[PDB]
């Protein structure tokens, strides 16, 4: 009622709709330097 509302509302996003109203996927990573030896750096290169 007065000065009260409902949290659950929806706008509507369907996958068959236009490209501007479709879900996407996002993956986010972080880069930092710490005061410890690094155990995840990357691959190496080897020659004959």
């Amino acid at each position: 009622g007065f000065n009260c509302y409902f949290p659950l509302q929806s706008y509507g996003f369907q996958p068959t709709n236009g490209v501007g109203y479709q879900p996407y996927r996002v993956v986010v990573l972080s880069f930092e330097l710490l005061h410890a030896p690094a155990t995840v750096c990357g691959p190496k290169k080897s020659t004959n």
């Binding site: 509302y5 509302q9 929806s10 706008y11 509507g12």
Partner: protein, 260 residues
């Protein structure tokens, strides 16, 4: 040479000279190089004295977490803003004449709008406002004749309206509203004439929508939907009359024989 009685602000000047982390103190000072910042980002910045600001035009948006600042001087001749965030609860009036040049504003937030009355021609010149974002607005005051001269407003909040007569062409000729909303509408007393002009409808919301059961007003539409029930969609695939659940009772609609 150091001069006394110049700076009123101690914290602001200290944070200006500290956050930048200058090379040393033996450098010179000026105004053009110092005023390169147009958007001040200082938490709980309570700068009140803005008098004589005509010598500093480059600032456009000022952030103020100062509930105490009720001075009208912040909006007497500050018409270059594009964003508004003022926690002035006792705002019973808005200064006039500031719309003479305000054309660079993009998005505004006006919460707790206690204006029970609205002025004439307030939005008349705002034809350039091609994008408006107004949410959780408390504009209980109903506009009186604004659609027939302005077709430029896009987003509106029209909750708790008892209009028995909708404006003509409010959704038909206004082709610029490619985003049309009718989600979980609770208009129990729908105006007569809604279903006719919506032949361009794309976003339909019929599932769990509690339409009335007035015999025999909506009966013809329900029969037509029943004859062509294969084109509609719902959350759960069930019988078509089940989606148009009768208000309150919910008993099957095939028991009462409506007299002619």
């Amino acid at each position: 040479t150091p001069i006394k009685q110049i700076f009123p602000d101690d914290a602001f000047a200290e944070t200006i000279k500290a956050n930048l982390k200058k090379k040393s103190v033996t450098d010179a000072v000026t105004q053009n190089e110092l005023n390169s910042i147009d958007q001040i980002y200082a938490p709980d910045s309570d700068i009140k004295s803005v008098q004589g600001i005509q010598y500093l035009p480059n600032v456009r948006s000022l952030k103020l977490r100062s509930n105490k600042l009720h001075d009208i001087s912040a909006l007497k001749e500050l018409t270059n803003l594009t964003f508004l965030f003022l926690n002035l609860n006792q705002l019973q009036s808005l200064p006039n004449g500031v719309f003479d040049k305000l054309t660079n504003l993009k998005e505004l937030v006006l919460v707790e709008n206690q204006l029970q009355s609205l002025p004439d021609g307030v939005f008349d010149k705002l034809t350039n406002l091609t994008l408006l974002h107004l949410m959780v607005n408390q504009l209980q005051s109903l506009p009186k004749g604004v659609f027939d001269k302005l077709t430029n407003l896009t987003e509106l909040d029209l909750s708790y309206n008892q209009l028995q007569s909708l404006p003509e062409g409010v959704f038909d000729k206004l082709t610029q509203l490619k985003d049309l909303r009718l989600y979980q509408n609770q208009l129990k007393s729908v105006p007569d004439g809604v279903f006719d002009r919506l032949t361009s409808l794309q976003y339909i919301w019929l599932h769990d929508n509690p339409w009335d059961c007035t015999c025999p007003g909506i009966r013809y539409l329900s029969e037509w939907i029943n004859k062509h029930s294969g084109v509609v969609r719902s959350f759960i695939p069930l019988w078509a009359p089940d989606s148009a659940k009768c208000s309150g009772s919910g008993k099957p609609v095939r028991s009462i024989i409506c007299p002619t």
